[PDB]
């Protein structure tokens, strides 16, 4: 605008490209929706199967065969908020596991 650009709030982009692969066949372990914005990755899963606050563990990966980073995660209803954007994510429900990947654009 005038001289500079006064940009209100953060630029938001809920990044909707992610894929899942899993060796489990339980539909209640596979995420139904994933999206990040900036850092916080929102993972909608069937967390309603997990009572007593016994929610599953989620890890982040820098690469698909990298180490599983425990990271910071908050659980809002059925959505896991992973604090920090990583190209790959790993979700572990008990001893079952699902892998997510965030796909870059070109």
């Amino acid at each position: 605008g005038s001289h500079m650009n006064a940009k209100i709030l953060k630029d938001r982009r809920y990044y909707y490209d992610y894929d899942y692969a899993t060796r489990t066949k339980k539909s209640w372990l596979i995420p139904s929706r994933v999206y990040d914005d900036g850092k916080f990755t929102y993972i909608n899963m069937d967390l309603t199967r997990f009572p007593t606050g016994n929610f599953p563990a989620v890890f982040a990966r820098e690469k698909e065969h990298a180490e599983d980073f425990l990271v910071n995660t908050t659980v809002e209803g059925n959505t896991l908020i992973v604090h920090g954007t990583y190209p790959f994510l790993v979700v572990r429900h008990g001893d079952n596991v699902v892998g997510l990947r965030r796909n870059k654009q070109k």
Binding site: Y14, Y16, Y18, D19, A21, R23, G99
Partner: peptide, 23 residues
Amino acid sequence: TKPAPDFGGRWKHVNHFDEAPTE
């Protein structure tokens, strides 16, 4: 320790198109 590939088998997109691209 995970002495086996965690994920694989079927890489399928799960991109947010839950009903609409967002709404």
